[PDB]
């Protein structure tokens, strides 16, 4: 996030980090319950990648995080790799997350929910702060 | 060129499709929602993370970080997967698995 600001540690407890087997962070995602994460289809997640929950400081080796293996990847079959439309993938975890002060789920909307233009919303992540 | 160690956040407005198409034109498709152009930008490594709004006091997932300006310009609209267009597919997938 360019020109964002540091979050309060643990205040976004559905935010996960998707990492390869070596610990490299390549995408974020959101816990929607103890067994499922929603993320983007273009992240290209596979069952060799891991969901890291409860993280704040990726440079801290001592933080209490949950490294969770992925059982199966459900890419939306309508994801359009030319137009980027329908950019959603579900990850079914092979071991459930343990909910806690720093790990819990975001709510999902209903399909007819309307969020007005101009509503102040929030986005989070460990993406670049400068390109 | 490296990512921050510590989780970042930014507040930002949802944009109407109409105001978003004033920059991105026909690249905006029916399962996309725009937000930002407000001095902040999602950038490399944010993809797949959340765009949340309050709905009845509780944070609700409205977008998934997807694409935008190729240099993460803070004055262009960021584009997110529109969760209301995709949540029926989410619920169907959970129910079947």
């Amino acid at each position: 996030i360019v020109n964002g600001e540091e979050a309060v540690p643990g205040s976004w407890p559905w935010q996960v980090s998707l990492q390869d087997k070596t610990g490299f962070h390549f995408c974020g995602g959101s816990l929607i319950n103890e067994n499922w994460v929603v993320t983007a289809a273009h992240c290209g997640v596979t069952t060799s990648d891991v969901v890291v929950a409860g993280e704040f400081d990726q440079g801290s080796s001592s933080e209490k995080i949950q490294k969770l293996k992925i059982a199966k990847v459900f890419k939306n079959s309508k994801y359009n790799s030319l137009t980027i439309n329908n950019d959603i993938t579900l990850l079914k975890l092979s071991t459930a997350a343990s909910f806690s002060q720093t790990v819990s789920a975001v709510c999902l909307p209903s399909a007819s929910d309307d969020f007005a233009a101009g509503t102040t919303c929030v986005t989070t992540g460990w993406g670049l702060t400068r390109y | 060129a490296n990512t921050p160690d510590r989780l970042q956040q930014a507040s930002l407005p949802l944009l109407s499709n109409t105001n978003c198409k004033k920059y991105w034109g026909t690249k905006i498709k029916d399962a996309m929602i725009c937000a930002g152009a407000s001095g902040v930008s999602s950038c490399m490594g944010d993809s797949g993370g959340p765009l949340v709004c309050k709905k009845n006091g509780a944070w609700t997932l409205v977008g998934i970080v997807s694409w935008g300006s190729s240099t993460c310009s803070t004055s262009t609209p960021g584009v997110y997967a529109r969760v209301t267009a995709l949540v029926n597919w989410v619920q169907q997938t959970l129910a079947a698995n």
């Binding site: 309060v8 540690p9 205040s11 976004w12 407890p13 002060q101 819990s104 789920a105 | 949340v52 944070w59």
Partner: peptide, 11 residues
């Protein structure tokens, strides 16, 4: 869902 145990602070 949607209610963090640690409340976010936005600026």
């Amino acid at each position: 869902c949607g209610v963090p145990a640690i409340q976010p602070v936005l600026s």
